[PDB]
Structure formats: C-alpha cells, structure tokens
From a paper:
We solved the three-dimensional structure of the PhoPol-II intein at a 1.48-Å resolution by molecular replacement. The crystal structure revealed the typical HINT fold with the β-strand insertion commonly observed among inteins from thermophilic organisms. In line with the loop minimization often observed for proteins from thermophiles, we could trace the electron densities for all of the 168 residues without detecting any flexible linker sequences, which were present in the structure of the PabPol-II intein. The relatively short helix of the PhoPol-II intein is rather reminiscent of a canonical mesophilic intein. Not surprisingly, the server returned the PabPol-II intein (2LCJ) as the closest structure, with a Z-score of 22.7, covering 164 residues with 1.5 Å-RMSD for Cα atoms. The largest difference between the two inteins lies in the flexible 19-residue sequence at the HEN insertion site for the PabPol-II intein, which is likely to be a remnant of HEN degradation during evolution. The sidechain of the C-terminal Gln166 in the PhoPol-II intein shows clear electron density, allowing the measurement of precise distances with other key residues. The distance between His154 and the carbonyl group of Q166 is 3.4 Å, which is shorter than the distance (4.6 Å) between the corresponding atoms of His160 in block F and the last residue, Asn172, in the PhoRadA intein structure. It appears that His154 stabilizes the side-chain conformation of Q166, making it less reactive towards the side-chain cyclization of Q166.
Residue numbers in the entry: -1 to 166
The structure:
C-alpha cells in the first residue's frame, strides 16, 4: 500500500487554527482503532480537524474532511525527493506524486518521477502556487517499522512538509 513516513508533516486545521502535524501525530489524534487485513485504521477524531487540500480543477487550496488515518507495516523502500530551494519529501516507491507539466498536474508513481520535474509549493499567506524543480532523487531502505496514510474526502491531495502539494 501507498504511504508516507510518520515524520512527514501535513497541513491541517485544528479547531479553526492552521498548523502542521506529523502523520504519526495525526494518527494519534484519532481513535477507535481497528486492526484488519494487516493494517490499523482509525476513523473517530479526538479534535475538530480538517485537512488542507489542493483542488486542481480550480487551482485553489480548500479544506476537507479526513475520513480515516492508517498505520501499516513498512514493506517497500521509500523514495526521497530533494527540491530546488532545499525542501524535501519521502513516499513509498509506488505512491502517486503530482508533478506540474504544461499547465496541469500529472499523477506519476514515485519511481517514475525524474530530476527536473516540477513540484508545486504553496505560499501559505497568499495561497499562491510556486514551482520548484526536483534536484535529486534517492532510494531509501525502509527506516521504521510502520508507515502512515490518510484518506481525505473528495480531493485526495495534501500539503506536506515545506508546503508541498502532493497526492494523498
Ligand atoms: Zn471520497
């Protein structure tokens, strides 16, 4: 399954306040827990929480509900993307990643992303999108026993680490 490392940060709105939490912390803000089909799923929120998403049909940041958070055993390698200006993120090898090409978001599996592909970051104050190139790609042996994901209602995009737009 597709996932992120637990130390990945995600932009959320908690009780009306925007902030970043790690995916591990996000998982802990839910209860409930059920273990089934080798994964742990939590659906009931402990705080009033929404996730910030990017709506590609309108080019706009939007808020949406979190349907569930998931913790799964780590199996595959991760891929780390280092971006122009020094930001970075990591996903499992087949995780969808959004790159910006010729005026649209292309959804590629992480292992198909190439150096020089463009990633979109958001300026949080103006909500303006900015383009940064992928500068380096690394394959990383899984470094923790569990990885984490979430399902965001409708848009299925999230804003991670240093304001990076990607697919949930
Ligand atoms: Zn849905």
């Amino acid at each position: 399954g597709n996932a992120f490392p637990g130390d990945t940060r995600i932009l959320v709105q908690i009780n009306g306040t925007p902030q970043r939490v790690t995916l591990k912390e996000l998982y802990e803000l839910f209860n409930e827990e059920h273990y089934e089909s080798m994964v742990y799923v939590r659906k009931k929120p402990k705080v009033d929480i929404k996730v910030y998403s990017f709506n590609p049909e309108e080019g706009k940041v939007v808020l949406t509900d979190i349907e569930e958070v998931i913790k799964a055993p780590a199996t595959d390698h991760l891929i780390r993307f280092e971006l122009e200006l020094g930001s970075s993120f990591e996903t499992t090898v087949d995780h969808p990643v959004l790159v910006y090409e010729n005026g649209k978001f292309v959804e590629k599996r992480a292992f198909e992303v190439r150096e020089g592909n463009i990633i979109i970051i958001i300026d949080e104050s103006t909500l303006e999108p900015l383009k940064v190139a992928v500068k380096k790609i690394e394959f990383i042996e899984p470094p923790e026993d569990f990885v984490f994901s979430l399902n965001a209602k409708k848009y299925h995009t999230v804003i991670i680490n240093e304001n990076i737009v990607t697919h949930q």
